[PDB]
């Protein structure tokens, strides 16, 4: 068992994203089971914090 | 099998004389001398611990199938700050990111690594994406 | 299964079941220990401040009031002096009506905890608060607050506090 | 070099709007937690000294 998390933009909105990925490697290809991933509206510090969280 | 264990009795000076003569016969001094509250220990003791071991282990499991489950959901939602502050960081600030979860098929993975790269080569291990791994091989 | 304590003068076996099967999973299985008592350690609540100072770890607030009705809280942080809320959202209320109830956090807001140094109190929601102790530990009061949409704790809006304890999971 | 200078004000614009809605955020978010507390407190006060002079 592995999952891989992967996050990208939403091309123009999210649900455009995740659903011409969703076709591509699980609709046509059937190389992964895929599903969206539930992350809230966190509170986004100053520049400054983030590059020391990663 | 080898051997027997026997009393011999002698004048309280003579130990010494004795288990040293002894030894040089090749005889063996069992040392010990009795205590009938010791006798009454080892008879205690090894029913005792017999006994505690199974007044522990219960409330022992329980304790780690609710701290591994604490421990588990912890995991998850630090991989929930990763991914949100690298999207924060390798995309544009206002936030506008979908995180997704894919979960490979067996031998298929080359394919896949291939079509997430097409799929987002123009944004530009590394990847041109955010991505992070969850096992679930916990065992080893 | 009854859990392992160190003693009570308020709660007995009915009320030491109905709890253990309520607390979060981050004190299931530990034993309780008592951190402050009004019959022990002289009732005032700069003493229930000082007693709570050294912990890191939840407590339960078991209170008894003039007509010897069982209710507190447990709650995520110990009680300290505060200038703003504080605590997590697993703190609840409780209550033996002389059934067993608890009021959850309702998702409404973060109101948990404060202490002044002169006062105690639990929940928020306009002037509201589901529970409030004076400096003494003599009067306090409950309303319906709705950080945890309470019944009203005791029989009365304002009671007296016949005695209290404070247990801590340790 | 000029328009890449023009992108990184409009990055900083971005964060200097982001941080003043997250200052607006807090101030009203502090402003409804201390009229909680204080007019908890204050009719709390008052209340039980007029219940002992009656």
Known sequence: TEFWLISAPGEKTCQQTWEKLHAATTKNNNLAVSSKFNIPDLKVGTLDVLVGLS | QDSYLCNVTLFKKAVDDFRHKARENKFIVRDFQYNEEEMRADKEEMNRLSTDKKKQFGPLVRWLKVNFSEAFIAWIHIKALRVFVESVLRYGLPVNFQAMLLQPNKKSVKKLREVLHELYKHLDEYYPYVYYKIDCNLLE | ??????????????????????????????????AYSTLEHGTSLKTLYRKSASLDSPVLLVIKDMDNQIFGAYATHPFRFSDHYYGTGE????????????????????????????????????GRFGLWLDADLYHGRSNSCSTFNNDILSKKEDFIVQDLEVWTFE | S?????????????????????????????AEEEFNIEKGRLVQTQRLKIMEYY
Request: proline residues 4%.
């Open chain 3, 1 to 34: 299964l009854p859990i392992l304590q160190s003693h009570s003068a308020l709660l007995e076996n009915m009320h030491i079941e109905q709890l253990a099967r309520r607390l979060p999973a981050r004190v299931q299985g530990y034993p309780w220990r008592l």
């Open chain 3, 91 to 126: 703190t609840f209320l409780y209550t033996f009506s002389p059934n067993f109830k608890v009021f959850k956090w309702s998702g409404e807001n973060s109101y948990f905890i404060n202490g002044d140094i002169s006062s105690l109190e639990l929940g928020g929601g306009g």
């Open chain 4, 2 to 30: 000029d328009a890449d200078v023009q992108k990184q004000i409009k990055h900083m614009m971005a964060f200097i709007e982001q941080e003043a809605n997250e200052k607006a955020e807090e101030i009203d978010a502090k």
